[PDB]
Amino acid sequence: MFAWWGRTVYQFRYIVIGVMVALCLGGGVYGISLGNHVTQSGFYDEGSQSVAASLIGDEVYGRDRTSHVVAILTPPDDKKVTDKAWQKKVTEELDQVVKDHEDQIVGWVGWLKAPDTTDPTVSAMKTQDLRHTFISIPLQGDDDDEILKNYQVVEPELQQVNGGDIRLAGLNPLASELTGTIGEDQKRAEVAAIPLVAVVLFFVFGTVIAAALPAIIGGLAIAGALGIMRLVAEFTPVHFFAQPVVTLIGLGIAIDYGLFIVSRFREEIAEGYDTEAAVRRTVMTSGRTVVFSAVIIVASSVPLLLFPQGFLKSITYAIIASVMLAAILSITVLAAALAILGPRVDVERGFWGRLVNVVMKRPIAFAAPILVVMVLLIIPLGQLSLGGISEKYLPPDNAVRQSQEQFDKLFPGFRTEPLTLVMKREDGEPITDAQIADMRAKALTVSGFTDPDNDPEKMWKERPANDSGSKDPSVRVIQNGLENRNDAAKKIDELRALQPPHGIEVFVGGTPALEQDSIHSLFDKLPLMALILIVTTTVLMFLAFGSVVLPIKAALMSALTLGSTMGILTWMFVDGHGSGLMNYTPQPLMAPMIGLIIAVIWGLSTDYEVFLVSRMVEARERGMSTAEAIRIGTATTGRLITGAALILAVVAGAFVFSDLVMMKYLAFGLLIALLLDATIIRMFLVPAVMKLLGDDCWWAPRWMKRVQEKLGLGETELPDERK
C-alpha cells in the first residue's frame, strides 16, 4: 500500500513541493510572534474545589494588589532616614516615576506618605535601626499576564531610583525573570547546537548537501509546528515553556528521521538499483517504519490529556503537532526531493559486527547480571517529595533571587501565604458571624496553627476587601498563616470534615491547598495513565509488526529502564548530590514534570527500539534464521542509533545550561535516559535475551494477522526487487 504512495509522490512533485514549502514559509512569518498568546497560568486542576473557590472569592472581593512588586530602598549614603532630605529626594524620584506614566501603575504605598503614624502594621514596616525601608506598589490590570507585560514595560525606571540604589522583588519580578529567560535560553540553544550537529552530520553524510537536507527539514518542521501552535492559540492559550520544548524536540526528531531515510537511500543506491524503484524501496521499508515511530510517539503522550493541567495539555498538543508534522513532511517530500537530487550526490562497522557476534555466541551471564544491576537503581527513588515551583530554584548568582532573600532576611514575617476558608451563601440569607466563631474554634481545637499574640482572638479574620468586590452577604472568608506547609496536608482532610449547620457552604483554598489538590488529582489518574499507555504502546508495536511477544517484553524492559533512569535523576536532584556541580539548590520536584518526562522518554526509547526490531524483522523476513538475521541487524541499526543518540545528546545538553532548574531537570534527565537506553540496550544485553528466547519468539495472533496484513501497513515482504 505504501509503494503506491511513494510512486504517486514520484509522479507529480512540483505541486506538493510548492504547497509544503509555501505553507511552512508562511507559517514562519505567521508565528514570528507566538509569545503574544503564551500564558503562565493553568498549572492546576479546575475539578479541585480549591482553584474554583479561590477564583470565586477573588471575583466577589477583588484582587489583593499588595504583593505585585515591592522595592527595598537604599538611602544616599550615610544620613539617617528620619529627617527631610532623604525622604524628599526619594519621594521626588517616586513622583517622577508616577508622573512619567499614569496608565501603568496605581499608587506607591509607603511609610513616607505618613511617616508620623503609629499603626503597628506600618510601624513594623521599618528596621530596628530604620535605615532599610521598602515601598509596595501594584500594576494596572486584572489578570497576571497583562500586569506582567506592564512590568516588563516600566521596570527600568523603577530600577534607576536613588543616588544609591533600590532592590525590587515580589510576585511579579521573579515571574518576569523566569519567563523572560526562555528567549535567551532558546537563542543560546540554536547558537551552541547548530555547529556541533552540523559538523558531525557533515562528517557522517559526506557532502555539503547531504548535511543540508536534515537541518533544513528540522528547521521547517519546527517552523510549521510553531505555526500550528499559533493557529491553535485562537481558542486555548499555551504555556511559554512550550516554545523551547517544541523548538528543540521537533528539531531532534526531524534530524533523526532525516538520517533515518538518507542513510537507507544511500545504501540502496550504492547497490546500483533503478532510481524510481530505489525511492520506492526507501518509502516501503523506511517510510513505513518512520510512520510507526511517529504514531507511537504521538500516542504515548496523548493519555496526559486525562490530567487537566493547561501546562500538560498545551505541551502534549505541542509534541503531537510537532512530531506528526515532521514525520508526514518527511515521508511526503524527502523522497521526491532526493529523487530530484540525482545519482551524483558526490573500520567501525567491522568491529561492531565482531563484537556483537562474539557477545551473542554466549552472552548468558553477560545478559543476566546486567539487567539486575540497574534494578538496584530502583532503591534511590521512593523518597518522592512535593515542592512545586518556588523561588529557590533560580541560581544564587541571580539578582532577583538574592534581592528577595535580602527582603525576607532584613524584613521577617512581612509576607505570608494564607489559606482561605470561603463561605458563599447559597441561601442568599445574610450571615451572622457567630457560626464563623463556632467554626474557627472548631478548627482551632486541632493543632498546627500560628498565633502572633498567644490569644485565639487574633487569628482567622476577613481578608482585605477592596471596593472592586461584591459587597453582599456572600462570603466572609477567614485566613491563617502556616506552621509548616506540608503538615497542612493532613489538615486538608479534617478541614473538610467539620460542618456548617444548615444552609451555608464552605470551601477551602490557598496556595498550598491548590498545589496539594493538583498533586492529589494527579495521583488519582496515575494507574489509568500508566496501564493504558503501556497496553496501547504494546498493541501498536504489534500492529506495526508481525509479532507481539517480543515487543511486549521489550516494552516491559523499557519500563524497567524508565524506572531506573528516573531513580537516577531523582538521586541527581531530590537527593542533592550534584547541587554544587550544577549550582542549584536541592529542592523538591514538580507535580506533572515527572509524568511528562517519563512519558516522553518512554516514547523516545520505544522509537529507537522500533527500528532495531524492524531491521531484525526485515533481516529475518529476508529468509535467514535467527543468528544471521540478528547478526546483520544489530550493528546495522547501531551505526544509525549511535549518530541519533549523539545528535540528541548534543541538542539536550544545550539545555543543561538554562538557569531554571526544572528545565535543567528535563534536559539532563531525558539525555541521560536516552543514552543509557539506546547504547546499553542495543549494545549488550537485549539482542542477547532475544536470541536466548529463540525462534518461537516470532509468533503472533493469526486472527489478528488477518487484519494486520490487509490494512495496508504490514508491508514486510518485498517482491524480489530487481538489480
Numbering used by the authors: 1 to 346, 385 to 761
Report text from the authors:
The mycobacterial membrane protein large 3 (MmpL3) transporter is essential and required for shuttling the lipid trehalose monomycolate (TMM), a precursor of mycolic acid (MA)-containing trehalose dimycolate (TDM) and mycolyl arabinogalactan peptidoglycan (mAGP), in Mycobacterium species, including Mycobacterium tuberculosis and Mycobacterium smegmatis. A detailed analysis suggested that MmpL3 is a TMM flippase that is absolutely essential for transporting TMMs across the cell membrane. MmpL3 consists of 12 transmembrane helices (TMs 1 to 12) and 2 periplasmic subdomains (PDs 1 and 2). Our structural data are in line with MD simulations that indicate the major conformational change of the transporter is located at the periplasmic subdomain PD2, where this movement can easily be interpreted as a rigid body rotational motion of PD2 in relation to the PD1 subdomain.
